[PDB]
Amino acid sequence: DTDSEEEIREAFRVFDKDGNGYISAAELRHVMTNLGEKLTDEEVDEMIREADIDGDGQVNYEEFVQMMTAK
């Protein structure tokens, strides 16, 4: 709850460039690339796709967490 899950809630919240309240695949490639690491769009696009429960190109913090670790 507030033990540490908070940092996760933050990092992901700030991540949403368009502060839409969720996370899209386009933001990952741009932000990661902007951060200094240029990932692969094919992996990114596929990344969320697998970590998507609603199937709306948008995933909250958890739906993502379970992914962040898994490569």
Q: Which residue has 């839409």 as its token pair? A: 20
CB atoms < 10 A from the CB of 68, how many?
13
- Contact between 53 and Ca ion by CB under 5 A: the answer reads yes
Give the one residue of 25, 28, 47, 59 binding Ca ion; rule: CB under 5 A.
59
- Contact between 14 and Ca ion by CB under 5 A: the answer reads no
- Contact between 64 and Ca ion by CB under 5 A: the answer reads no
- Contact between 52 and Ca ion by CB under 5 A: the answer reads yes
On the CB side of 5, CA atoms within 13 Å amount to 8
Give the one residue of 5, 6, 46, 54 binding Ca ion; rule: CB under 5 A.
54
**In terms of Cα–Cα distance, which of 44, 48, 71, 43 is closest to 60?**
48
Annotated binding site for Ca(2+): 16, 18, 20, 22, 27, 52, 54, 56, 58, 63
